[PDB]
Amino acid sequence: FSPAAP
Amino acid sequence: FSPAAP
Amino acid sequence: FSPAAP
Amino acid sequence: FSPAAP
Amino acid sequence: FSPAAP
Amino acid sequence: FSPAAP
Amino acid sequence: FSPAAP
Amino acid sequence: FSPAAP
Amino acid sequence: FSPAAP
Amino acid sequence: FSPAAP
Amino acid sequence: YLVPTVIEQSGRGERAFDIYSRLLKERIVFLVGPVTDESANLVVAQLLFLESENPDKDIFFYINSPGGSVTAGMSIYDTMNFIKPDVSTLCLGQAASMGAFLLSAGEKGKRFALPNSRIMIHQPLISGGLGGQASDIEIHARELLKIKEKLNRLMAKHCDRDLADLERDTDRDNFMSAEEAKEYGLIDQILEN
Amino acid sequence: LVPTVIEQSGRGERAFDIYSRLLKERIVFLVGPVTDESANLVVAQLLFLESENPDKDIFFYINSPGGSVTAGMSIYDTMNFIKPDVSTLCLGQAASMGAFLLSAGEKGKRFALPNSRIMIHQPLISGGLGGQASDIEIHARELLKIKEKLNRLMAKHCDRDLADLERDTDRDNFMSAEEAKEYGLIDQILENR
Amino acid sequence: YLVPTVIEQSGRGERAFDIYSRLLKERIVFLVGPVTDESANLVVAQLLFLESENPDKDIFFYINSPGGSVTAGMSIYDTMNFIKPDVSTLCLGQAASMGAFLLSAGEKGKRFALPNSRIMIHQPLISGGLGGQASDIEIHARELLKIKEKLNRLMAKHCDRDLADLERDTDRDNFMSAEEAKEYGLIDQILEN
Amino acid sequence: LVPTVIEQSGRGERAFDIYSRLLKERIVFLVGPVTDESANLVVAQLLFLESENPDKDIFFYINSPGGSVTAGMSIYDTMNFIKPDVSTLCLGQAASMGAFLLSAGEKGKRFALPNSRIMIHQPLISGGLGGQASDIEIHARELLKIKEKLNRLMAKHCDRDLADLERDTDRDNFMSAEEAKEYGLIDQILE
Amino acid sequence: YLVPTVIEQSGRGERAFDIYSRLLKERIVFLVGPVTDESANLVVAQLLFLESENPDKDIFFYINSPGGSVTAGMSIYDTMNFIKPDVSTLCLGQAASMGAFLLSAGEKGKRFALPNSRIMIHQPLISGGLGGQASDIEIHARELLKIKEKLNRLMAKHCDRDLADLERDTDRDNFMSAEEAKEYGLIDQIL
Amino acid sequence: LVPTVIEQSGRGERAFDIYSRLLKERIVFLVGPVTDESANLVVAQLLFLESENPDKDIFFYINSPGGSVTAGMSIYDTMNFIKPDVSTLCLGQAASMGAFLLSAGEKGKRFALPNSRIMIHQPLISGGLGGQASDIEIHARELLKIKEKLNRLMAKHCDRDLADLERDTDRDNFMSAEEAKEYGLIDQIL
Amino acid sequence: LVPTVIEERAFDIYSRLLKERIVFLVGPVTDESANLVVAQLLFLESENPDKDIFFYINSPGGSVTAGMSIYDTMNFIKPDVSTLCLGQAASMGAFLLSAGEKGKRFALPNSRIMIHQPLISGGLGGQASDIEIHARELLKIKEKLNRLMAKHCDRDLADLERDTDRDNFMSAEEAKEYGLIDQILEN
Amino acid sequence: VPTVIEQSGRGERAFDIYSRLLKERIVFLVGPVTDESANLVVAQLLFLESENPDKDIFFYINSPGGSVTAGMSIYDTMNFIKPDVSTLCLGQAASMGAFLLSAGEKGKRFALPNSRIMIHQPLISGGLGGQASDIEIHARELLKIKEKLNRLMAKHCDRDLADLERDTDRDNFMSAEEAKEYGLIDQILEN
Amino acid sequence: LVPTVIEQSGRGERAFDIYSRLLKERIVFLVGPVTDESANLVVAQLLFLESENPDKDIFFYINSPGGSVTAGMSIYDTMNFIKPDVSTLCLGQAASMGAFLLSAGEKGKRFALPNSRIMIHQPLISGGLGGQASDIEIHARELLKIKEKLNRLMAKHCDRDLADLERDTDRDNFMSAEEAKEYGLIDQILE
Amino acid sequence: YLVPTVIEQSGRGERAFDIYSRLLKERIVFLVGPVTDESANLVVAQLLFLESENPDKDIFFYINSPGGSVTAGMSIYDTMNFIKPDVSTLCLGQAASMGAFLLSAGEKGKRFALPNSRIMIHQPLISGGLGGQASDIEIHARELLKIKEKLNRLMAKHCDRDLADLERDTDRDNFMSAEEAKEYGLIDQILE
Ligand SMILES: [K+]
Ligand SMILES: [K+]
Ligand SMILES: [K+]
Ligand SMILES: [K+]
Ligand SMILES: [K+]
Ligand SMILES: [K+]
Ligand SMILES: [K+]
Ligand SMILES: [K+]
Ligand SMILES: [K+]
Ligand SMILES: [K+]
Numbered sequence A, B, C, D, E, F, G, H, I, J: 001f002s003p004a005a006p
Numbered sequence K, M: 001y002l003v004p005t006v007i008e009q010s011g012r013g014e015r016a017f018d019i020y021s022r023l024l025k026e027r028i029v030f031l032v033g034p035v036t037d038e039s040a041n042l043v044v045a046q047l048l049f050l051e052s053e054n055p056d057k058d059i060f061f062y063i064n065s066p067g068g069s070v071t072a073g074m075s076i077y078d079t080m081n082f083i084k085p086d087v088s089t090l091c092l093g094q095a096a097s098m099g100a101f102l103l104s105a106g107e108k109g110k111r112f113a114l115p116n117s118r119i120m121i122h123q124p125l126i127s128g129g130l131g132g133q134a135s136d137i138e139i140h141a142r143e144l145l146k147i148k149e150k151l152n153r154l155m156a157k158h159c160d161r162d163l164a165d166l167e168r169d170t171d172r173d174n175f176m177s178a179e180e181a182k183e184y185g186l187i188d189q190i191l192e193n
Numbered sequence L: 001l002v003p004t005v006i007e008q009s010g011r012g013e014r015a016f017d018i019y020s021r022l023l024k025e026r027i028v029f030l031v032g033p034v035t036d037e038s039a040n041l042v043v044a045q046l047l048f049l050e051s052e053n054p055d056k057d058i059f060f061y062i063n064s065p066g067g068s069v070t071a072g073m074s075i076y077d078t079m080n081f082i083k084p085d086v087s088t089l090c091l092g093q094a095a096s097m098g099a100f101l102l103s104a105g106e107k108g109k110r111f112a113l114p115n116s117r118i119m120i121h122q123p124l125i126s127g128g129l130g131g132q133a134s135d136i137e138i139h140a141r142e143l144l145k146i147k148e149k150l151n152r153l154m155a156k157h158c159d160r161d162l163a164d165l166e167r168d169t170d171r172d173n174f175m176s177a178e179e180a181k182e183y184g185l186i187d188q189i190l191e192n193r
Numbered sequence N, S: 001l002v003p004t005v006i007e008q009s010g011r012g013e014r015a016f017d018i019y020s021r022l023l024k025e026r027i028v029f030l031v032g033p034v035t036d037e038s039a040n041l042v043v044a045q046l047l048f049l050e051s052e053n054p055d056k057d058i059f060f061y062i063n064s065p066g067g068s069v070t071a072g073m074s075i076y077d078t079m080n081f082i083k084p085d086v087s088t089l090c091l092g093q094a095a096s097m098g099a100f101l102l103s104a105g106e107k108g109k110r111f112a113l114p115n116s117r118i119m120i121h122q123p124l125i126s127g128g129l130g131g132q133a134s135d136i137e138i139h140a141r142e143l144l145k146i147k148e149k150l151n152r153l154m155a156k157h158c159d160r161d162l163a164d165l166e167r168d169t170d171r172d173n174f175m176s177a178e179e180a181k182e183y184g185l186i187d188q189i190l191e
Numbered sequence O: 001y002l003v004p005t006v007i008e009q010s011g012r013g014e015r016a017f018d019i020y021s022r023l024l025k026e027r028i029v030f031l032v033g034p035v036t037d038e039s040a041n042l043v044v045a046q047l048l049f050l051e052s053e054n055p056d057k058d059i060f061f062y063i064n065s066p067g068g069s070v071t072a073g074m075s076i077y078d079t080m081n082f083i084k085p086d087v088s089t090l091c092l093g094q095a096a097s098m099g100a101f102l103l104s105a106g107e108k109g110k111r112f113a114l115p116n117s118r119i120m121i122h123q124p125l126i127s128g129g130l131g132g133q134a135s136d137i138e139i140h141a142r143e144l145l146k147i148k149e150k151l152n153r154l155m156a157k158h159c160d161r162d163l164a165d166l167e168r169d170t171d172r173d174n175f176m177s178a179e180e181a182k183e184y185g186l187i188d189q190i191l
Numbered sequence P: 001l002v003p004t005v006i007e008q009s010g011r012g013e014r015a016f017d018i019y020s021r022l023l024k025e026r027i028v029f030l031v032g033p034v035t036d037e038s039a040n041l042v043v044a045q046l047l048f049l050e051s052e053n054p055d056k057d058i059f060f061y062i063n064s065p066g067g068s069v070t071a072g073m074s075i076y077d078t079m080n081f082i083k084p085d086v087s088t089l090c091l092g093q094a095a096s097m098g099a100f101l102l103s104a105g106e107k108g109k110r111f112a113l114p115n116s117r118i119m120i121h122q123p124l125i126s127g128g129l130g131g132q133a134s135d136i137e138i139h140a141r142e143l144l145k146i147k148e149k150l151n152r153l154m155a156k157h158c159d160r161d162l163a164d165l166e167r168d169t170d171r172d173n174f175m176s177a178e179e180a181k182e183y184g185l186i187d188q189i190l
Numbered sequence Q: 001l002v003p004t005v006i007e008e009r010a011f012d013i014y015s016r017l018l019k020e021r022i023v024f025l026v027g028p029v030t031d032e033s034a035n036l037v038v039a040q041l042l043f044l045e046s047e048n049p050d051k052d053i054f055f056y057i058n059s060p061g062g063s064v065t066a067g068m069s070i071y072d073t074m075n076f077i078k079p080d081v082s083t084l085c086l087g088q089a090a091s092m093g094a095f096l097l098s099a100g101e102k103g104k105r106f107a108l109p110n111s112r113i114m115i116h117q118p119l120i121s122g123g124l125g126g127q128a129s130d131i132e133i134h135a136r137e138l139l140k141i142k143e144k145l146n147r148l149m150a151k152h153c154d155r156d157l158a159d160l161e162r163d164t165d166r167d168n169f170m171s172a173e174e175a176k177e178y179g180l181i182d183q184i185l186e187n
Numbered sequence R: 001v002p003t004v005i006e007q008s009g010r011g012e013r014a015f016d017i018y019s020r021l022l023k024e025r026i027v028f029l030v031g032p033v034t035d036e037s038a039n040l041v042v043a044q045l046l047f048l049e050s051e052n053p054d055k056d057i058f059f060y061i062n063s064p065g066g067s068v069t070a071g072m073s074i075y076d077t078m079n080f081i082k083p084d085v086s087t088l089c090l091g092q093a094a095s096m097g098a099f100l101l102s103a104g105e106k107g108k109r110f111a112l113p114n115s116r117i118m119i120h121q122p123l124i125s126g127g128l129g130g131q132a133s134d135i136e137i138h139a140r141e142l143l144k145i146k147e148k149l150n151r152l153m154a155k156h157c158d159r160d161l162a163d164l165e166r167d168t169d170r171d172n173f174m175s176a177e178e179a180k181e182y183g184l185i186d187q188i189l190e191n
Numbered sequence T: 001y002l003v004p005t006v007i008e009q010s011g012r013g014e015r016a017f018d019i020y021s022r023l024l025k026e027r028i029v030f031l032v033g034p035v036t037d038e039s040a041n042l043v044v045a046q047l048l049f050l051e052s053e054n055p056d057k058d059i060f061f062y063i064n065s066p067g068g069s070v071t072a073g074m075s076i077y078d079t080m081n082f083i084k085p086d087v088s089t090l091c092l093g094q095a096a097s098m099g100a101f102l103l104s105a106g107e108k109g110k111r112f113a114l115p116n117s118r119i120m121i122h123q124p125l126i127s128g129g130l131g132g133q134a135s136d137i138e139i140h141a142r143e144l145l146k147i148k149e150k151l152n153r154l155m156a157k158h159c160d161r162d163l164a165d166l167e168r169d170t171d172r173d174n175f176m177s178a179e180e181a182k183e184y185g186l187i188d189q190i191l192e
Helices: K019-025 K037-053 K070-082 K098-104 K134-159 K163-169 K178-184 L018-023 L036-052 L069-081 L097-103 L133-158 L162-168 L177-183 M019-024 M037-053 M070-082 M098-104 M134-159 M163-169 M178-184 N018-023 N036-052 N069-081 N097-103 N133-158 N162-168 N177-183 O019-024 O037-053 O070-082 O098-104 O134-159 O163-169 O178-184 P018-023 P036-052 P069-081 P097-103 P133-158 P162-168 P177-183 Q013-018 Q031-047 Q064-076 Q092-098 Q128-153 Q157-163 Q172-178 R017-022 R035-051 R068-080 R096-102 R132-157 R161-167 R176-182 S018-024 S036-052 S069-081 S097-103 S133-158 S162-168 S177-183 T019-024 T037-053 T070-082 T098-104 T134-159 T163-169 T178-184
Strands: K005-009 K014-018 K028-032 K059-065 K087-096 K111-113 K118-121 K174-177 L004-007 L014-017 L027-031 L058-064 L086-095 L110-112 L117-120 L173-176 M005-009 M014-018 M028-032 M059-065 M087-096 M111-113 M118-121 M174-176 N004-008 N013-017 N027-031 N058-064 N086-095 N110-112 N117-120 N173-176 O005-008 O015-018 O028-032 O059-065 O087-096 O111-113 O118-121 O174-177 P004-007 P014-017 P027-031 P058-064 P086-095 P110-112 P117-120 P173-176 Q004-006 Q010-012 Q022-026 Q053-059 Q081-090 Q105-107 Q112-115 Q168-171 R003-007 R012-016 R026-030 R057-063 R085-094 R109-111 R116-119 R172-174 S004-008 S013-017 S027-031 S058-064 S086-095 S110-112 S117-120 S173-176 T005-010 T013-018 T028-032 T059-065 T087-096 T111-113 T118-121 T174-177
Touching: K005 K019, K005 L014, K005 L018, K014 K019, K019 K028, K019 L036, K028 K037, K028 L036, K037 K059, K037 K070, K059 K098, K059 L036, K059 L069, K070 K098, K087 K098, K087 L036, K087 L069, K098 K111, K098 K118, K098 K134, K111 K178, K118 K178, K134 K163, K134 P133, K174 K178, K174 L133, L004 L018, L004 M014, L004 M019, L014 L018, L018 L027, L018 M037, L027 L036, L027 M037, L036 L058, L036 L069, L058 L097, L058 M037, L058 M070, L069 L097, L086 L097, L086 M037, L086 M070, L097 L110, L097 L117, L097 L133, L110 L177, L117 L177, L133 L162, L133 Q128, L173 L177, L173 M134, M005 M019, M005 N013, M005 N018, M014 M019, M019 M028, M019 N036, M028 M037, M028 N036, M037 M059, M037 M070, M059 M098, M059 N036, M059 N069, M070 M098, M087 M098, M087 N036, M087 N069, M098 M111, M098 M118, M098 M134, M111 M178, M118 M178, M134 M163, M134 R132, M174 M178, M174 N133, N004 N018, N004 O015, N004 O019, N013 N018, N018 N027, N018 O037, N027 N036, N027 O037, N036 N058, N036 N069, N058 N097, N058 O037, N058 O070, N069 N097, N069 N133, N086 N097, N086 O037, N086 O070, N097 N110, N097 N117, N097 N133, N110 N177, N117 N177, N133 N162, N133 S133, N173 N177, N173 O134, O005 O019, O015 O019, O019 O028, O028 O037, O037 O059, O037 O070, O059 O098, O070 O098, O087 O098, O098 O111, O098 O118, O098 O134, O111 O178, O118 O178, O134 O163, O134 T134, O174 O178, P004 P018, P014 P018, P014 Q004, P018 P027, P018 Q004, P027 P036, P036 P058, P036 P069, P036 Q013, P036 Q022, P036 Q053, P036 Q081, P058 P097, P069 P097, P069 Q053, P069 Q081, P086 P097, P097 P110, P097 P117, P097 P133, P110 P177, P117 P177, P133 P162, P133 Q168, P173 P177, Q004 Q013, Q010 Q013, Q013 Q022, Q013 Q031, Q013 R003, Q022 Q031, Q031 Q053, Q031 Q064, Q031 R017, Q031 R026, Q031 R057, Q031 R085, Q053 Q092, Q064 Q092, Q064 R057, Q064 R085, Q081 Q092, Q092 Q105, Q092 Q112, Q092 Q128, Q105 Q172, Q112 Q172, Q128 Q157, Q128 R172, Q168 Q172, R003 R017, R012 R017, R017 R026, R017 S004, R026 R035, R035 R057, R035 R068, R035 S018, R035 S027, R035 S058, R035 S086, R057 R096, R068 R096, R068 S058, R068 S086, R085 R096, R096 R109, R096 R116, R096 R132, R109 R176, R116 R176, R132 R161, R132 S173, R172 R176, S004 S018, S013 S018, S013 T005, S018 S027, S018 T005, S027 S036, S036 S058, S036 S069, S036 T019, S036 T028, S036 T059, S036 T087, S058 S097, S069 S097, S069 T059, S069 T087, S086 S097, S097 S110, S097 S117, S097 S133, S110 S177, S117 S177, S133 S162, S133 T174, S173 S177, T005 T019, T013 T019, T019 T028, T028 T037, T037 T059, T037 T070, T059 T098, T070 T098, T087 T098, T098 T111, T098 T118, T098 T134, T111 T178, T118 T178, T134 T163, T174 T178
Parallel strands: K028 K059, K059 K087, K087 K111, K087 K118, L027 L058, L058 L086, L086 L110, L086 L117, M028 M059, M059 M087, M087 M111, M087 M118, N027 N058, N058 N086, N086 N110, N086 N117, O028 O059, O059 O087, O087 O111, O087 O118, P027 P058, P058 P086, P086 P110, P086 P117, Q022 Q053, Q053 Q081, Q081 Q105, Q081 Q112, R026 R057, R057 R085, R085 R109, R085 R116, S027 S058, S058 S086, S086 S110, S086 S117, T028 T059, T059 T087, T087 T111, T087 T118
Antiparallel strands: K005 K014, K118 K174, L004 L014, L117 L173, M005 M014, M118 M174, N004 N013, N117 N173, O005 O015, O118 O174, P004 P014, P117 P173, Q004 Q010, Q112 Q168, R003 R012, R116 R172, S004 S013, S117 S173, T005 T013, T118 T174
């Protein structure tokens, strides 16, 4: 899940 | 239970 | 149990 | 059951 | 059981 | 059953 | 299953 | 199982 | 977990 | 466990 | 369980009775707990017996039931309608499903509930299930639907209401206080003292 | 086993089970969990005693963990309907519906023994709610209706506000006999005399 | 199981009795086995009946019990203390927990044990669980502690001892011979022949 | 089903279940496991029989595998308290608490049928001890007091030393009627 | 199950009896089904009762049993031998194991079987378990063998045969017709 | 426990479990009851074989008592969708959904071994229908749609009149391989 | 037992289809079956954030929260997630199918779709207060699912409220007509 | 299940998909928190730090909760190690799951738009049984846990202690937006 | 399912399950109940790590409710025998034998994480003591020998009076990480 | 029940082992938990293998067991006695019943216990089980008594003690500390 996780 | 039953 | 019941 | 018992 | 009960 | 009980 | 999936 | 499958 | 284990 | 096993 | 013994006075004779047999002498009949073939038939038997004792006096049918078997309930229903005496009905505790049906079936004008009684109506349900061939399931589905239709038709007449109302109001569980059942037309009067 | 005791009458030295013997003194027991059958047995005894003498007090002895709400309501409505004052007495414990009925006695004549324990709480359900959301909403709603009604009637029994009972039944509330009296659930604690 | 039938040869009658009803006639009451609401209430029922037969003659309460429900026991306790007749207690076999509590509660001077009876006392136990929320467990723990405190306090009075002694000596299971129980203050006399 | 039987009476005819009939002759049965309930019934019968006549013998017939110790003790203490001599008779078997009660009959009036079996041993517990070490110690200690008391009481019954009973109950000890007599458990064997 | 009520018209009056109590009145006693402490003690009570009613008249012990408890069976046996009345025995259906023991124990000359009756004898068996220390198992092994030796010995005396005959013939299940049972010496006559 | 065998491709020496070995010759098995997992695994193999070669026949070996209809339909639709002819062969038995899938093979390429057993019948439900009449009506209606769909699709597989399938599936109908061929359910017996 | 296919490299047949960006949801939706799906979706995106992903659903439904984790992943990632119903798509399965990229939601011709309101399997037990909290939450689930389904189907909320009141079975053609899927794949 | 290829710069290597995601510093907590599942998380956190102590770690949570002691081992690890542990809720974060979610590095606590959060006080099932003393000791401990949990959640959420006490008395369900408003997470991730 | 990780190094690179990877850094886990199998596994790891380097510290991570006394002691004796210092670290909980082993770590090197829970008490038995009184006394006496030994060793581990341990282990004794340090059971809390 | 993987270094290579196989290379063999046919035969298999690797080096038999099957225990016992290598025995945790028997059976001088090990010896038990004819019970009682006699005779010899002592001291459960087991003659040394 990026941004931002990653 | 009267009246009325009985 | 009296008094009072009975 | 007789004779003989009873 | 007497004496004493009863 | 006697003698002796009863 | 193409086309189109894939 | 051939013929014919395969 | 260091310092100090390890 | 040495000495002595092993 | 233990059922207490009480003494009735007669014509200088004295009679020991279990308390339910004693209440039966004043023409009170109980339906308590689930409705089964056996509990329904016992009620039928008592209704028949009371009529033969006196075909003109009212009978007082006391109901505290979650319901139960539909065909068992109908055997009671059909006996209540057949015999000459008015069968007054009274709800104590609760009258749900077949229990409410029978409560609603009492002689019009003589359907009663105690103030904190709970009444509940809904459509037929089956537990255990339908299993087998599609043909058999269709047959039983059709019968369950006929039952649904007939019970609603009969309930509508008991409540003096339009069929569409009963169909709307039994789609899911419908809980009523004594006043709401009275408003609905399911009973006639709420007893206080 | 229930011991059999001998009562002398006019032309009938009869054997009675000990509970039938105390019933003759207008004492009715509620012992153990309240079920449809145990509650209805009580209703029958209450109706019978009123029949014996509509003016004398009735003495309702309660030792119960509570039980079925509707079964309890059938006892409640009977206590209120019949002409005799129904005195209540708590021996052992009166919890939930047992305490409800205890508080429901004729005001002034609600008693507890000194080491009696009373407990009140909001309704619990065991078993569960299944399954469709629409159905769960209906039963949840009904459960909340039962919760408020019981709290409301209790408020009247105790001469308190609904908000008091809602606060004080939120979780299990154990009371000594003295606290139950201070609360308004009973009138007097017996000891001797 | 078969309870033998016994004949009592009155004068106006020859009477058959089950053997325990026959013993009830001489003011003997049994508490045998676990103390339950129903076994306890049966004892209460006999105590009240015996008082009505003669408010002045001693009653003899024979105890062989490992204990049971605290609230059921308290209903016997409060009944023992309320009625006018002195309640003699006799331990045969064993009197444990609430059994020991009730034994020690007999009229002082009239509490007995047979020479090989076993008496045991301890703090309250629960079997089953404390569930579920922390708030609820707190409520029930506090209640258990009040029961603990109260039982120690009352036992201290029965035994004519310091509260701190009962607190110390009931911390774990405390078995006493008939002689140790007399020396402790739980009973008055050990029966000879 | 228990057979019903017509009583020989000086006041008429009375129907009885056959056991109530035998109770009229002051015969009391202990059959099967000793429970609080089976024992309290015996206690009630002993007391009742004394009440009918405090001087006539009572005949206590035992066919029992034993059972609850405390339940057994209630019978024992009742036997010793009441005025009537309580004769004991073993038919079939008297094991454990059964054997204890048999040996507890009035000296001289303890009987066995020729093929009866007697068995004695040390206390057994079933279920188990749980759970905290402090608690197991307390109960172990109570069990040892019981073992010694029972041995002590049995020795007096058998006119032997405590040490004999300790030795002879360490494991299961089965006795014929004759061996039970020689041991001192009963007085006479019936013919 | 329902037991029929029967009317006896005994000169002048009228008395209702359950059908088994009715046959007891004619000194007929049933042992039916498995022998337990309760079913055996029930038989014992009836034998004693019948002896008290008339100590000189024969008693008729009807047996339809697959057997059961050895100690329970022995309490019946000893009562049969002890009481003054001759206890005639009759096998209907079957008499197996302790059932056959009791059948063979009837007063000699008065042991009967119905013609299609089945009789079976064998050595003692145990069900369940002896579990424990070798010391405990040895003890119970020895007790089981004493029982076996005693039973063979008593059966030999009942059948008027050699111990060695009984030892070999009870090694495994030994089914006998009424005729074989008579020929063996286990019963006297076939009805 | 499944035997390991050696295949020899070119620069090969490949060990295979014996079923993965038969899969390389475009043989796919349906054995035992049809479930979501057993049906989907077949689907995955059909798709894979198509990707290896969209033109070569695939050989679907069926020894099955049947099982889930919807699971069976996922196999059916995959058979009809993919470009390769899916030949079917019944060894042992093809009952219910099993017989349905056997009959669904490419016409001309439906086979049975001489002692195979075929059985067709109407839809069943195992377990029960509870609880409200409205819900029971809904599922009963759905079951009847399945009965009709399956009879119509089966009639098309067998080249027969609908009324025949309706008549012949009312109760369990056991067919020998010859009767199934005669019926139009398979094409040839080996 | 899952067969092994060769690509130099040997694969279980499902990992072989994952390489062609095919992800399966088969059987009941649980935390574990749903999270495995989420992981494969994230992985396919890292391999190529622009190529479509193909989500094959043969499922009777299952856990709602487990279902939402898949849903929120399908919506979050850059690749279009095409959905295809083979066998059946019922309840949460039907929800995930209708949630595929609009224009790229498919069914095989004899697929079955079913939608209904949330149910509880087992019980609500305990204090009335607790039952109210959970009843309230079940109704929030019902309301959200209806609004989201309506948006998936491009229909008014009132349509789904009416149409999920009881078990609602659809053929592939009916699912397409309803707005739940876009095309039926013949061959 | 399934097997995935990571072609490194090192070489081509087959991975199960979770090990593949672990390489990107993604750690999963899925399902009930047990001693085993929590310790596995602790091991992955420690391992990721040794690989690189400065890069963020991404803790993905889909959990109904479970054991408090198992959960605290995860919590203290999140707090001890140098890397920021970002938390992300997919599906649900309930009880200890919510606690752990709220424990992510402030600013890096995330939820997906339809994820669900639930918080409440500690409960026990199975039960507390036995002696009053023992029950008191465990009640006291359960109450201590409740105080610690409220105090830490209030600190995690930047809220007053009295708020958390109020809002955890019973099951408190929150949407992602409500969880954000409460202080439980920082952002809701849409695309 | 245990994640697979890659050790990069001077070897090239190898694949490890994550726990084997942690073992390489001399970290050993005791998680969950102490059984013969889990304990011996720990023993094997202690012996192996010592053979790898008899001078480097070993790090024993404990999250355990306890379990078998005898199994626990096998770990304890191995900790005390081998040359390496065995540091102990409590995450989640160390209860009973878990706390014993925690307390047994090299003095100066016993650690707990800030929210770890420690519990100590006297020995318990579950299942029960059943059979002969002779046998129950033997097992009671042995349970009491165990109680005495543990109190004496814990007292030595904690540098406290024997009497303190006896009083403080009489019933379940829950401690925070801070209270455990104050008690002398651990040396430092790692924030 | 994961079993850690460890790495061994040696001439021309690097090799991966489950940790118990790793300890087997150093001639350490475990008996852990109940003694069964399968656990006993596994021990027998490891003993025979170690002898074939080197018939003169000691073997180290680590025992943590509550006991178990007598015949299964005897197969280990007879194997210990047969092979050329000395079988040192070491008790960790506990050696009870057949566990204590095998412990006492190590090469004399090389039987060890860790300081907190527990030893327990007692007479043979059969778990509840037995049905049959009096003849069959006699046969199995007799056999159980032979086993009892053999075990006492063999234990007395392991312990260099009088038979009458073992008979006396195994009548009921006999728990020993490591120190007591050494005083009794059951082990030789306690390791500190
Ligand atoms: K009428
Ligand atoms: K009134
Ligand atoms: K008094
Ligand atoms: K006497
Ligand atoms: K005779
Ligand atoms: K095709
Ligand atoms: K997308
Ligand atoms: K950090
Ligand atoms: K060390
Ligand atoms: K050797």
